[PDB]
Amino acid sequence: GPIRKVLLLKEDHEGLGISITGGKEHGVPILISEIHPGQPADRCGGLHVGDAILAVNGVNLRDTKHKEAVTILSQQRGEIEFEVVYV
């Protein structure tokens, strides 16, 4: 599908509310495999299971390894802009 920009709002006491799978070492993008109910990704409305995360706050996630992506995503705070694509 089309490349989408999606805004997520979160406070520092909570996580993003997503589970991710994949990574370059698996030949798979960083994929959202779970949206957890009532947590920031669910609340923002624009992120879906099966979305590939290409970037977050302008930080590239293309061709990142799984744990590289975990560190990058978990560092983001406040108003977070996701660049995602559903394939």
Binding site: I18, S19, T21, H26, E34, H66, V70, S74
Partner: peptide, 8 residues
Amino acid sequence: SRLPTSKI
């Protein structure tokens, strides 16, 4: 289960 999954 071949792929890793992380909750974030």
